[PDB]
DNA sequence: TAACAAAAAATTTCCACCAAAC
DNA sequence: TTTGGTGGAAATTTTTTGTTAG
């Protein structure tokens, strides 16, 4: 399937090797504490640790380089110049979908406005409701058959509301993209 | 970032149809 | 073209608590 799948990941440094070695010690000594409390404890008794105990995890992890050097050059060695392309194809991917998702996080952040509902958007906010069917996905088969078979006079009431959250969805951009200026983001700002 | 855990919280997904912005 | 919008239940991803180092 998935050449990154099979390929040999990264040994545990230090730190890490200490959290996982801890966590079960932690957890049994405190069932009803959360995960993220008994992480912020593991890491304050790391913090708290000598060097030299430190040391010892370290050891460990910088043998197991070795180790990992070995298989992973074992690995990509055995590989075809194809599989090799894509797995530097499928890691390309895996940094675009992380770098999309967190813009998209950012502008969520920034509260920017909804785009614009289409006459047929209005329609299912309104028509899915009562709609026939059981699961979601065929009660938008019923409203998609309604909208469909519906005429021009009819539509023209979702024409209109359409046609109003239109001069909304202008107005909060107008503002919200102003906004934008004043905190020194018009990277944010459309070109068109 | 990518290495560990692990379950909470956030986001996509499934179907279609539609439109703004690139 | 891509993206995100109408619906919500279920599936899936990201985040939450941390440090390390290639």
Redesign the pocket.
């Known amino acids: 399937s998935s050449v990154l799948a099979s390929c040999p990941?990264?040994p545990?440094?230090?730190?890490?090797r200490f959290?996982?070695e801890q966590?079960?010690i932690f957890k049994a000594q405190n069932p009803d504490a959360?995960?993220?409390e008994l992480?912020?404890r593991?890491?304050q008794r790391?913090?708290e640790l000598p060097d030299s105990k430190?040391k010892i995890y370290?050891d460990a992890?910088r043998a197991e380089?070795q180790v990992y050097k070995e298989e992973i050059s074992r690995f990509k060695e055995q590989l075809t110049p194809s599989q090799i392309m894509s797995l530097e194809k499928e890691?390309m991917d895996?940094?675009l979908?992380?770098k999309?998702?967190?813009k998209?996080?950012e502008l969520?952040l920034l509260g920017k406005p909804?785009?614009?509902?289409?006459?047929?958007?209005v329609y299912?906010?309104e028509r899915?409701q009562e709609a026939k069917g059981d699961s979601?996905?065929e009660?938008?088969?019923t409203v998609?058959e309604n909208?469909?078979n519906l005429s021009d006079s009819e539509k023209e009431l979702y024409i209109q509301h359409?046609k109003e959250d239109?001069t909304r969805y202008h107005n909060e951009?107008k503002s919200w993209e102003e906004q934008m200026i004043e905190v020194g983001r018009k990277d944010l700002l459309?070109?068109?």
């Open positions: 990941k990264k545990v440094s230090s730190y890490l959290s996982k966590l079960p959360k995960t993220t992480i912020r593991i890491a790391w913090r430190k370290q992890y380089w890691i895996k940094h979908k992380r999309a998702m967190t998209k996080k969520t909804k785009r614009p509902r289409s006459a047929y958007n299912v906010a899915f979601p996905q009660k938008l088969k998609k909208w469909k359409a239109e951009m459309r070109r068109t």
